[PDB]
């Protein structure tokens, strides 16, 4: 019948919206010429972005496969099922003992959700403090203000690292007896060592508690058997599919069924309908795409390289006498203790930003005040993806150091007020010279 | 020194997944979609969703970030703010917006939390009358939605005609003493008396909360009552009728309540979320530019004109509708006339490539064996359907309704049996063919 055109515009973003296209293309390029040392950032590849852009996100699909509110969910169903399967395979667990939910929109969501399923409203949860390397959704609150809902929706007590920066199993086991919570969370944001799960598993049993393991930072190591495996001990294991796993921004919630029969029911309800509506099927498709990469030799070889680059960088840094929290690293992350140079993480953070090196201020055990953090963290997953090898860590080390020394210098010339110091970065030529060296080093590396 | 990543295309890298995805696209092409909460994204939005900006962690707000390297992220979040306020014609001295909530349901738990806090009292419309799960909905078996557990909730209802009961809204409000009143709904075919609610709110010093997810595009284009003039918070999903990606927006009236900005913006982060999804913010920003064009006003017009057109055809064919018509993109048919269930017709229609969903009617007390169905015109409109085509749609439903009565008589009243009828049936095989040829024919974004 006589043609009437759709009411849409399928032209490219370049033609259709020049303003946005330009801003985005400036980001892709800023990315290329930056040395990304943010332990939680990574680069997605073609396949994953292709899924994220897939039309499958048109489909509303509240419910779980074969139990959906709307119809027309056969290919959605097959895809979510393929996702469960790749997820289980990726971590060597079996559908009999373990099940998984792939509908959470991010990690924080996965966490609140899995927590609530376990504990309910004003239930008792226990996790590591933030400044010591816990995540906000581990029950963080500070002073009067309950900062994370996990602190307000639940009763949360926080444990801490000792002075050497390790988790104090004794202090853990204490609070466990004292506060007596219903769930103990481990898995951490910025902890440079492996986690003693056997340990936590026992403390949990003494107190008859749930053992909750957040591997968002180190998911790939677990998968590749390069760290302890929490899946031996834990009742619930969640992870972001981004960061070290190099997938889309989404999350997983794995649950131990043999340890808690009908826990699946509890987890699923919390995700939908307690917390969420329709899933984001492109996220799901994208996550299935990456989990297949994960169960791969090339991905195993990438994971190990991340570990090898990190430890290599630690050597380089210790060789230059820098003081590292816990004095090394079992993983992709490292925290530098900066107080020896009379400089704050904050200051160094701005110095590195100004020379196209991205990292972030961190806390050393001895900073009681999270106000003025005295360290920084750095991670190798982004550089490793971009092809850096162990020998390439020498250069990173030399630069950080150069950056540390330039921080003291300006600090004094312009003052120890962040506002003042910050202005020493604006018109400095010693900074344009480092940025140049950096930008050229970075532009050269492969980019996904 | 080769990078340690495989940039191969999805076809090559993961043919299994690629296949399923393709099968998905063609299922969409060959389906007459009447699901009132589905639409189609266009090339640019999806380009944005795949954009690498998602690689970047932007915990915090523009110029208030934790990490450095957020210059363009900031430009873009701000651009999103700008195009957002602009889309709904409100002003940045009067109104603020938060573009970080990852979905509609999140936008709602966050906003609510920001306004009332733990165990605060909220009042919303009952699911079965068209309130969303996030509007405080609880069963008496369970607290189905977290919104019923984390907050104290009371559900209001609609009357036997299907209209919101303004007096019942106002009785419950005086008895309950809630701090937030929610209006804006999932399967309600008329416009909302925001002014009525603003009155019933003051009289109890509650916040008027408008969730305009289903009808967002109309409000923007002034084809429906504007909640902006009377509400304290407005939430919407940028998908559905607004046709953007899957994300949400919270809009807040500063002038009505100063310092509201901190409460909303803290609720989103760090109370609830973490790193935003910068692809999503981008694609929202992309789509809010389209909303503010003649072409998209011309679109919303058609969605509406097609809806009313379809209600006319259905009414001529003597179907019964809640409220006897629609003021928007949605229509709910009362199926009792045919002694048929929404489930059964849902099933019949899937079998013949027509998507639509069962919906309860004021007579019903349950979410199971509901007596009606819901249909909406946003997607067919996008695909270039006009008023003349609602006649095809109407006959086709009428056929389905008939074939449902028929199969019920033959195969049995229990759904399990009935589902059995739809398999290898040539009257169905034939309708499917009719529908596929028609649908396959239309534009597809
Ligand atoms: C980053 C992180 C999260 C939450 O990530 P989102 O940004 O909310 O997706 C949860 N747990 C850990 C350990 C994390 O590092
Ligand atoms: C669909 C809907 C929501 C929730 O959106 P999701 O993206 O599915 O979480 C909230 N409110 C209304 C009115 C809706 O129609």
């Amino acid at each position: 019948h006589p043609f009437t055109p759709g009411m849409f515009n399928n032209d490219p973003l370049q033609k259709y919206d020049k303003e946005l296209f330009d801003l985005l293309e400036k980001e892709k390029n800023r990315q290329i010429e930056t040395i990304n040392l943010i332990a939680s950032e990574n680069l997605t590849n073609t396949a994953v972005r292709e899924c994220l852009g897939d039309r499958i996100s048109n489909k509303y699909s509240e419910g779980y496969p074969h139990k959906r509110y709307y119809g027309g969910n056969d290919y959605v169903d097959k895809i979510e099922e393929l996702c469960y399967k790749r997820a289980l395979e990726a971590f060597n667990v079996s559908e009999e003992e373990w099940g998984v939910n792939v509908q959470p929109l991010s990690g924080s969501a996965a966490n609140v959700q899995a927590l609530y399923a376990l504990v309910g409203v004003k239930g008792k949860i226990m996790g590591m403090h933030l400044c010591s390397g816990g995540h906000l959704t581990h029950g963080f609150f500070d002073e009067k203000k309950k900062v994370s809902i996990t602190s307000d929706l639940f009763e949360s007590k926080l444990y801490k690292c000792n002075s050497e920066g390790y988790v104090d199993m004794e202090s853990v086991r204490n609070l466990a007896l004292s506060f007596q919570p219903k769930v103990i969370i481990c898995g951490y944001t910025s902890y440079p060592r492996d986690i003693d799960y056997k340990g936590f598993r026992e403390i949990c049993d003494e107190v008859n508690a749930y053992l909750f393991a957040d591997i968002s930072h180190i998911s790939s190591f677990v998968a590749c058997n390069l760290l302890n495996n929490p899946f031996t001990y834990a009742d619930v294991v969640t992870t972001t599919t981004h960061k070290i796993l190099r997938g889309p921004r989404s999350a997983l919630i794995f649950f131990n069924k043999k340890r808690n029969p009908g826990i699946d029911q509890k987890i699923n309800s919390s995700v939908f309908p307690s917390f969420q509506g329709g899933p984001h099927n492109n996220k799901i498709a994208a996550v299935a795409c990456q989990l297949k990469e994960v169960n791969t030799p090339e991905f195993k070889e990438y994971t190990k390289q991340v570990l090898l680059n990190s430890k290599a960088l630690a050597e380089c840094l210790l060789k230059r006498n820098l003081d590292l929290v816990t004095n090394g690293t079992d993983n992709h992350l490292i925290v530098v203790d900066l107080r020896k140079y009379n400089i704050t993480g904050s200051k160094l953070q701005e110095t590195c930003n100004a020379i196209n090196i991205a990292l972030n201020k961190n806390t050393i055990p001895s900073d009681v005040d999270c106000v003025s953090p005295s360290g920084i963290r750095i991670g190798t997953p982004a550089l490793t993806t971009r092809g850096c090898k162990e020998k390439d860590m020498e250069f990173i080390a030399d630069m950080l150091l150069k950056a540390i020394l330039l921080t003291d210098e300006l600090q004094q010339k312009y003052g120890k007020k962040l506002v003042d110091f910050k202005k020493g970065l604006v018109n400095n030529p010693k900074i344009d010279e480092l940025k140049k060296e950096v930008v050229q080093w970075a532009k050269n590396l492969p980019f996904a």
Side-chain angles (χ1 to χ4, degrees), chain A residues 346-379:
Chain A
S346 336
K347 285 206 190 56
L348 191 52
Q349 179 172 319
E350 306 292 333
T351 296
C352 299
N353 277 328
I355 52 169
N356 273 22
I357 292 156
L359 48 101
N360 36 81
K361 59 193 165 189
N362 222 63
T363 285
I364 31 197
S366 69
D367 295 310
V368 179
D369 190 359
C370 235
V371 147
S372 188
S374 306
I376 54 166
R377 78 169 176 33
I378 32 152

Side-chain angles (χ1 to χ4, degrees), chain A residues 40 105-109 111 135 137-138 187-189 214-217 238 240 242-243 249-251:
Chain A
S40 63
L105 292 192
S106 247
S108 301
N111 275 350
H135 187 247
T137 80
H138 297 161
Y188 314 105
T189 286
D214 189 316
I215 57 189
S216 319
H217 262 265
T238 67
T240 59
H242 47 305
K243 314 182 167 170
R249 278 187 193 264
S250 174

Side-chain angles (χ1 to χ4, degrees), chain A residues 211-260:
Chain A
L211 173 62
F212 196 102
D214 189 316
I215 57 189
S216 319
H217 262 265
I218 82 238
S219 41
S220 295
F221 296 124
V222 172
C224 302
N225 260 355
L226 287 160
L227 286 194
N228 296 338
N229 182 12
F231 280 102
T232 306
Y233 294 107
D235 301 284
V236 161
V237 181
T238 67
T239 171
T240 59
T241 61
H242 47 305
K243 314 182 167 170
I244 197 163
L245 205 70
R246 209 209 259 159
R249 278 187 193 264
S250 174
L252 296 160
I253 310 203
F254 292 90
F255 41 76
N256 190 319
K257 279 191 285 171
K258 164 177 187 171
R259 288 207 188 217
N260 304 273

Side-chain angles (χ1 to χ4, degrees), chain A residues 387-436:
Chain A
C388 286
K389 302 279 135 167
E390 307 110 303
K391 82 220 170 218
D392 292 300
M393 302 300 89
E394 249 283 318
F395 175 83
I396 265 68
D398 278 325
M399 205 72 48
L400 302 184
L401 186 38
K402 283 191 178 139
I404 289 153
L405 302 167
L406 217 96
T407 302
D408 209 322
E409 185 165 332
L410 310 164
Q411 189 193 32
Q412 278 171 335
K413 194 193 153 188
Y414 291 86
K416 285 173 202 180
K417 298 274 205 146
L418 179 63
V419 242
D420 300 320
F421 165 76
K422 201 173 162 180
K423 298 167 194 174
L425 311 151
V426 188
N427 273 304
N428 203 301
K430 301 190 67 192
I431 279 185
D432 328 288
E433 292 319 304
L434 289 149
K435 191 181 153 162
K436 275 198 149 197

Side-chain angles (χ1 to χ4, degrees), chain A residues 162-165 321-327 335-346 348 362-368 372-376 404 408 411 416:
Chain A
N162 66 42
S163 35
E164 277 321 296
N321 274 326
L322 292 184
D323 295 296
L324 308 180
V325 182
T326 91
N327 279 311
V335 174
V336 174
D337 179 335
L338 276 203
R339 58 198 180 148
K340 155 185 193 148
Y341 289 77
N342 203 253
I343 273 146
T344 52
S346 336
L348 191 52
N362 222 63
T363 285
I364 31 197
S366 69
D367 295 310
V368 179
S372 188
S374 306
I376 54 166
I404 289 153
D408 209 322
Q411 189 193 32
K416 285 173 202 180

Side-chain angles (χ1 to χ4, degrees), chain A residues 60 62 276-280:
Chain A
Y60 239 96
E62 316 173 84
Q276 294 199 169
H280 288 13

